[PDB]
Amino acid sequence: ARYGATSTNPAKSASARGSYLRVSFKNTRETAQAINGWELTKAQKYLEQVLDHQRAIPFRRFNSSIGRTAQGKEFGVTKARWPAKSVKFVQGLLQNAAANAEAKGLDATKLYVSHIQVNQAPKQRRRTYRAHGRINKYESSPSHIELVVTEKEE
């Protein structure tokens, strides 16, 4: 409970979240923004295509020195990627939200991702060893992901 700021009707909505998920926060933020606002079935199909490397996730903020591809053209970018782990976690949350909408009795054909946000979970800490007997951090950047799908109405 107590999701991020949402402006939708909770009666026509269904929520899903996952916390302390050991998946790259930056990649997952880009993945979530890729489907923010999309219809549920369109977003799920797009995510399967991303997994299949037919479409890509445009990397808009966390994209420094990543790489360029022609699959970013449909989003008006040169920098896009295929963050399979982030996509799989987002698909798990999407199907959980779809199940919750079904249990609420919502119209599955009117569901669109009305809210999706990723923020940084506490970092899991490891150590890496460096020249001249030095030790640096080797931490993960896990994610809290939350989303709510709502019935589109007028």
Site for Mg ion, residues 90 to 129, rule: CB under 5 A: 129
140 binds RNA (CB under 7 A): yes
- Residue 148 gets which letter from DSSP? E
**H or E element: which one contains 43?**
helix 40-51
Round to whole Å and give the CA distance between 86 and 88: 5
Angle subtended at Cα 2 by Cα 15 and Cα 152, rounded to the nearest 5 degrees: 35
Number of residues interacting with RNA: please give it, by CB under 7 A.
78
State which of residues 8, 39, 41, 84 lies at the interface with RNA (CB under 7 A): 84
Q: How far is the CB of 140 from Mg ion (least distance, A)?
A: 10
**H or E element: which one contains 88?**
helix 84-104
Binding mask 48-77 for RNA (x = CB under 7 A): -----xxx-----xxxxxxxxxxx-xx--x
> What is the per-residue DSSP string for 110-152?
SEEEEEEEEEEPPPP--EEEETTTEEEE-----EEEEEEEEE-
Closest CB to Mg ion belongs to which residue? 133
Q: How far is the CB of 108 from RNA (least distance, A)?
A: 13
137 binds Mg ion (CB under 5 A): no
State which of residues 9, 48, 107, 128 lies at the interface with RNA (CB under 7 A): 128
133 binds Mg ion (CB under 5 A): yes
Residues making contact with Mg ion (CB under 5 A): 129, 133
